[PDB]
Amino acid sequence: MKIGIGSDHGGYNLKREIADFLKKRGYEVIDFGTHGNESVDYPDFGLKVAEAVKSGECDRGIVICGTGLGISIAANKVPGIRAAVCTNSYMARMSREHNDANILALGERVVGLDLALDIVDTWLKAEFQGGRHATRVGKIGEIEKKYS
Amino acid sequence: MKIGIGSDHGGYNLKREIADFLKKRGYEVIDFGTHGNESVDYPDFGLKVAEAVKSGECDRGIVICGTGLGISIAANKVPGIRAAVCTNSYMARMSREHNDANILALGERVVGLDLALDIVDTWLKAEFQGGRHATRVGKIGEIEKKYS
């Protein structure tokens, strides 16, 4: 399974830690940058990860900024993307079980490293439950079709 | 200002509490439902609040479900909406200061009542900081325009 990862300078150090964690577990990782601490704009990297997920070049993505908010809002602008900002494993599990999220968003200034690794572990392992959740995901798709 | 609020059955009881909190503080509140514990679909209510914010009929909105994730992802599919799922006051403040969020998303199964009122209080008071944050918000607008 291939994981795209991306961040602004606010999520860069946590991104390096997560890239390292994911490889150790045998995931293939595509790092879309950013590639240092220089100030950059979270929507550009949100977009790269979200577009790699939409095109099937990654199966899912993880996006990181100070809070997770900006980069996840930007990712969710892409039709077919469901980016979930999670600050605990319960939200991470539900985002997979219920929302079928294909992007996990994290905030490097909000969650400490080991908590964020717990969240990523939970999210990678949880599974979509279909049923009424698929119905609701289709209704998300109807919003996208409306404003397309 | 006027605040739109909406929820599925997962966010209904916390919605009733926040509506009451907001009125006590002299805000005008437009409740978009849901109106009971009957099982309903979070995208429908996310859309109502998001479209009311987009059309200026509300100035800001608050959307609530079990986790906040699904309804905020749905809200974010609307162009001009920036829905922030917050689990603490720090995220709520940053979502205003940096992301100029015009919808707050909460999860009734994740944050307890007093924490959620703290977050709402923080979010309603925080102010957009412009500058490089305005630039980044514009780049979110470029994503919208691309998939429009």
Ligand SMILES: O=C[C@H](O)[C@H](O)[C@H](O)[C@H](O)CO
């Ligand atoms: O949404 C903004 C992100 O959290 C950034 O990581 C943050 O805004 C930082 O202050 C860059 O100026």
Ligand SMILES: O=C[C@H](O)[C@H](O)[C@H](O)[C@H](O)CO
């Ligand atoms: O995903 C949907 C929301 O969190 C709901 O509030 C919840 O999942 C519901 O129990 C499912 O029917």
